Nucleic acid binder design. Structure first.
Ligand SMILES: [Mg+2]
Ligand SMILES: [Mg+2]
Ligand SMILES: [Mg+2]
Ligand SMILES: [Mg+2]
Ligand SMILES: [Mg+2]
Ligand SMILES: [Mg+2]
Ligand SMILES: [Mg+2]
Ligand SMILES: [Mg+2]
Ligand SMILES: [Mg+2]
Ligand SMILES: [Mg+2]
Ligand SMILES: [Mg+2]
Ligand SMILES: [Mg+2]
Ligand SMILES: [Mg+2]
Ligand SMILES: [Mg+2]
Ligand SMILES: [Mg+2]
Ligand SMILES: [Mg+2]
Ligand SMILES: [Mg+2]
Ligand SMILES: [Mg+2]
Ligand SMILES: [Mg+2]
Ligand SMILES: [Mg+2]
Ligand SMILES: [Mg+2]
Ligand SMILES: [Mg+2]
Ligand SMILES: [Mg+2]
Ligand SMILES: [Mg+2]
Ligand SMILES: [Mg+2]
Ligand SMILES: [Mg+2]
Ligand SMILES: [Mg+2]
Ligand SMILES: [Mg+2]
Ligand SMILES: [Mg+2]
Ligand SMILES: [Mg+2]
Ligand SMILES: [Mg+2]
Ligand SMILES: [Mg+2]
Ligand SMILES: [Mg+2]
Ligand SMILES: [Mg+2]
Ligand SMILES: [Mg+2]
Ligand SMILES: [Mg+2]
Ligand SMILES: [Mg+2]
Ligand SMILES: [Mg+2]
Ligand SMILES: [Mg+2]
Ligand SMILES: [Mg+2]
Ligand SMILES: [Mg+2]
Ligand SMILES: [Mg+2]
Ligand SMILES: [Mg+2]
Ligand SMILES: [Mg+2]
Ligand SMILES: [Mg+2]
Ligand SMILES: [Mg+2]
Ligand SMILES: [Mg+2]
Lengths: 193, 99, 51, 148, 203
RNA sequence: UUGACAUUGUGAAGAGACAUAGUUUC
RNA sequence: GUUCUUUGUAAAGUGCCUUCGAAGAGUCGAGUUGUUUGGGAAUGCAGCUCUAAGUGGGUGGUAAAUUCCAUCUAAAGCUAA
RNA sequence: UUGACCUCAAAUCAGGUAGGAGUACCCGCUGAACUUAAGCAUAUCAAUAAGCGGAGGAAAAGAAACCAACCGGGAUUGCCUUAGUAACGGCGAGUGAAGCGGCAAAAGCUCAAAUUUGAAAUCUGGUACCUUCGGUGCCCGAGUUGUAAUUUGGAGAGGG
């Protein structure tokens, strides 16, 4: 059961795997229903759009924070600055997220401004009865595309004070590495009587 | 903080004009209160000490705080609670059988 | 769970449909294919939009 | 498809092309990777030296992401400027106005220095740089500005 | 109110006043039948904070369940199999004593719904519990927007399916790195990770 | 089967320590 | 869409000042046994022994002491797709 | 002697409820060995089969005692991916998940712990009437060993 110069495989098929095979023979079916579902909802939902207004958010972890991406909901602060309570903001098709937290003003401003633009481009029919027919835009998201902030200018003057960048990293690496040891010499030399 | 704006190092990270949010009350879930302070004080002098607590203070008066922690760490979960428990005892003693 | 469908690379799929469009002119091909087109004006056959 | 297959061809010959003597039986060598250290060792050392036993450090809960950091060599670099715009910057090599290239924005994390870039000044914004990359870049009158 | 005093007092189980109390009560209960209707919570502050309410439609039951391990049934210890499975005597039972207690009153009051249950006392032999129940056909309950959820049929025998608090404990249902196995519901999340997903246009 | 712990409480004489007041242990 | 009763001396939202701010225990936690998990000086579950606090408590995938930091708010509960 | 209260009973007491079935899929318990390792005990088969208890049209999960370590994300479920990877493993045969990212769908909240104390403001039931999935009057009863209003950590309460 081992021969030739072949790569070692690991095909985990030693349990009763034939009992747990899913074929999406129903791929076309679900697409249709999915679509039917959406057409039905757009109806029921009267002139409202199918989605909620979502906040901009810088993504987490070292690998994705260059990108910005739709978050969940707007934060009690952003809603407040945007000139509305959240109780209401919720009835107006704005998603609000009581657990997200502002620590970054650039994003904060962005979001408030997102709310201003939203508020101004929506229209809220009176409670009354009249229902002045106004036709549905289906996507809050299409209407208000989240985009990546521009971070510089195309071209610009060159400023070289001389400091290797490389060697700056090297040095920064270093400082952190011996931060603790130097603190022990600092303690240990303070205990000089 | 303030981040250094480079990609390794001590205060590593991208510089952002920062904000410091409002504070969540869910961050003060431990905090005392005069109500619960009052009650807990009250219940204590009703129900008094408990078997392992008696052994603690006597162990304190008769063998020091370190031998008390060592026991109390066994009795309770751990060294940190034991710290706290011994203290609490130290203060049953001072407050009462002293001043 | 036999494989029933087959993937063709989108681009190659075009290379083909393109090719097939190109041969709908080229009367010999059309003729050779069934298709009784000896007695038609010219090929491609383009008919009024009014259709 | 079945019609092109060699079992169609074997029909009528007794042994299906697997021998009268040594048959085709269930699992002669054992199953799977059995015997790796015994009756299948000649095939393993040779073809798979290195297989048995251990090296280095275990790392519990390693998160590839932490170490995300694609390399781009100078070798390209000028690729991250759109063509049109590119030619425009090559000619008019200059301080006062040189192109800014955010290499993080192109999704790379380190610039390395594979091989020769023309003398045009670039301003290069990166998380990390090889010593050489940053050297070759200055030799064209550019710099590296460290971002994050 | 008193309930805050009850609460704190009950955290002193080794206190002189409490262990008098505890020793007397545990004798009483053991004289009574293993499942018996209770007149009223003996821990009113506990019951309360778990859903109890002093209105017709809430019932309290007291119950005993034997302590210790689960001795593996099997005649004469004989296990017939590999030796990892030859064990019989250090075997522990994945549900909890508390869960058995909910289950045995649950069956005893099929017309009722178990809401929750709290510990009251133990000895060498038994752990004692009070189970608080609701009557879903009782009109006082069917009105009351807060509790009529219990009146639905999806909550038939929640104790039998580990959907009460104890049940959800042992069922491993919590969020986090510590619960990956057991969280969407262990058997289900297993089945998931062992399903072979084949698309029309194979990936 | 043997030990420890838990179920486990109340007196009394006697041993045992802060080092010959009685909280504590056999 | 119409139409009748006005539910009110009712109910709800928001700005500033001040004082407060109650938040689940034989549980968390620990020891040990056994089972389980990719979870490694121990991933979950259970049995028995021990058993908390309130600037506390849990988590931070290598045990420990020390010092900080980050991050949620357990031991009660409902909920469409 | 008379009347309570606590606790425990009885009735062919007035009205209700549970059982059994089905069980593809769902929530638990319990629990194998054949097999693979070319032998075999750990391992594997498998947290599988068989046995048991319990639901629904879905069930379960669910508004974080979460993920993270970032310029931070933000209920749950599922698909694509992460990945046959981190890791486990007579480190042998074998096993083996998670965070980030895209997408489907989207949705949020309730108690406990508080003096209404210038007024238990709450509720089952019987009954007569009615415009009967209910309302109103009245009478027993429940309930202060706490039924409503009020508040749920995002807060929120009392004063001004
Ligand atoms: Mg498979
Ligand atoms: Mg097999
Ligand atoms: Mg199918
Ligand atoms: Mg949508
Ligand atoms: Mg209207
Ligand atoms: Mg083939
Ligand atoms: Mg064929
Ligand atoms: Mg042929
Ligand atoms: Mg041939
Ligand atoms: Mg032939
Ligand atoms: Mg031949
Ligand atoms: Mg052959
Ligand atoms: Mg033959
Ligand atoms: Mg190997
Ligand atoms: Mg290259
Ligand atoms: Mg009653
Ligand atoms: Mg067996
Ligand atoms: Mg075993
Ligand atoms: Mg697993
Ligand atoms: Mg293929
Ligand atoms: Mg006994
Ligand atoms: Mg809590
Ligand atoms: Mg088991
Ligand atoms: Mg374990
Ligand atoms: Mg530590
Ligand atoms: Mg409830
Ligand atoms: Mg639920
Ligand atoms: Mg429903
Ligand atoms: Mg009757
Ligand atoms: Mg049945
Ligand atoms: Mg098994
Ligand atoms: Mg088989
Ligand atoms: Mg074998
Ligand atoms: Mg064999
Ligand atoms: Mg054999
Ligand atoms: Mg196993
Ligand atoms: Mg079965
Ligand atoms: Mg049905
Ligand atoms: Mg559905
Ligand atoms: Mg449900
Ligand atoms: Mg919450
Ligand atoms: Mg955060
Ligand atoms: Mg999430
Ligand atoms: Mg292998
Ligand atoms: Mg396994
Ligand atoms: Mg995502
Ligand atoms: Mg809701």
């Amino acid at each position: 059961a081992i021969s030739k110069n072949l790569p070692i495989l690991k095909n985990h098929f030693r349990k009763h795997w034939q009992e747990r095979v899913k074929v999406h023979f129903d791929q076309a079916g679900k697409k249709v229903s999915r679509r039917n579902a959406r057409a039905t909802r757009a109806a029921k939902i009267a002139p409202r759009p199918l989605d909620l207004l979502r906040p901009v958010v810088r993504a987490p972890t070292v690998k994705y924070n260059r990108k910005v991406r739709a978050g969940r909901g707007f934060t009690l602060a952003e809603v407040k600055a945007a000139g509305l309570t959240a109780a209401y903001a919720r009835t107006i098709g704005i998603a609000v997220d009581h657990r997200r937290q502002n620590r970054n003003q650039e994003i904060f401003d962005a979001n408030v401004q997102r709310l201003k633009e939203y508020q101004s481009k929506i229209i809220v029919f009176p409670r009354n009865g009249k229902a002045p027919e106004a036709e549905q835009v289906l996507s809050a998201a299409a209407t208000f595309p989240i985009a990546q902030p521009a971070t510089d200018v195309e071209a610009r003057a060159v400023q070289d004070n001389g400091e290797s960048a490389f060697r700056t990293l090297r040095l920064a690496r270093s400082e952190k590495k011996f931060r603790g040891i130097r603190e022990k010499r600092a303690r240990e030399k303070a205990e000089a009587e | 903080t303030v981040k250094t704006g480079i990609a390794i190092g001590l205060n590593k990270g991208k510089k952002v004009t920062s904000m410091t949010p409002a504070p969540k009350i869910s961050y003060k879930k431990g905090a005392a209160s005069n109500r619960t302070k009052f009650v807990r004080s009250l219940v204590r002098e009703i129900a008094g000490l408990s078997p392992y607590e008696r052994r603690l203070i006597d162990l304190i008066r008769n063998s020091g705080e370190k031998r008390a922690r060592k026991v109390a760490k066994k009795r309770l979960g751990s060294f940190t609670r034991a710290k706290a428990k011994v203290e609490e005892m130290n203060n049953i003693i001072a407050a009462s059988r002293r001043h | 769970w036999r494989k029933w469908n087959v993937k063709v690379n989108h681009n190659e799929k075009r290379y083909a449909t393109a090719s097939a469009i190109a041969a709908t002119a080229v009367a010999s091909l059309v003729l050779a294919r069934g298709h009784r087109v000896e007695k038609i004006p010219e090929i491609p056959l383009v008919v009024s939009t009014d259709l | 498809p079945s019609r092109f297959t060699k079992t169609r061809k074997h029909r009528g010959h007794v042994s299906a092309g697997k021998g009268r003597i040594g048959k085709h039986r269930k699992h002669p060598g054992g199953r799977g990777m059995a015997g790796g250290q015994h009756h299948h060792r000649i095939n393993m050392d040779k073809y798979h030296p290195g297989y048995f036993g251990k090296v280095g450090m275990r790392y519990f809960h390693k998160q590839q992401a932490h170490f995300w950091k694609p390399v781009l060599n100078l070798d390209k670099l000028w690729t991250l400027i759109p063509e049109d715009k590119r030619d425009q910057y090559l000619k008019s090599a200059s301080k006062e106005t040189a192109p800014v290239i955010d290499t993080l924005a192109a999704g790379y994390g380190k610039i390395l220095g594979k091989g020769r870039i023309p003398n045009v000044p670039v301003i290069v914004k990166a998380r990390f740089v090889s010593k050489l990359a940053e050297e070759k870049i200055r030799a064209a009158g550019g710099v590296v500005e460290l971002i994050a | 109110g008193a309930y805050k005093y009850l609460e704190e007092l009950q955290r002193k189980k080794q206190s002189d006043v409490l262990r008098f109390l505890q020793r007397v009560r545990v004798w009483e209960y053991r004289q009574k039948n293993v499942i018996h209707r209770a007149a009223r919570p003996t821990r009113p502050d506990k019951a309360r904070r778990l859903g109890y309410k002093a209105k017709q439609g809430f019932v309290i039951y007291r119950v005993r369940v034997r302590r210790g391990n689960r001795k593996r049934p099997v005649p004469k210890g004989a296990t017939y199999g590999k030796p990892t499975n030859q064990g019989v005597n250090e075997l522990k039972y994945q549900r909890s004593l508390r869960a058995t207690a909910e289950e045995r009153v649950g069956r005893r009051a099929a017309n009722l719904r178990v809401l929750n249950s709290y510990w009251v006392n133990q000895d060498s032999t038994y752990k004692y519990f009070e189970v608080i129940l609701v009557d879903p056909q009782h009109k006082a309950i069917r009105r009351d927007a807060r509790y009529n959820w219990i009146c639905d049929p999806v909550h038939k025998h929640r104790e039998a399916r580990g959907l009460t608090a104890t049940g959800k404990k042992s069922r491993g249902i919590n969020k986090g790195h510590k619960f990956n196995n057991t969280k969407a519901g262990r058997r289900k999340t297993w089945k998931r990770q062992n399903t072979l997903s084949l698309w029309r246009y194979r990936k």
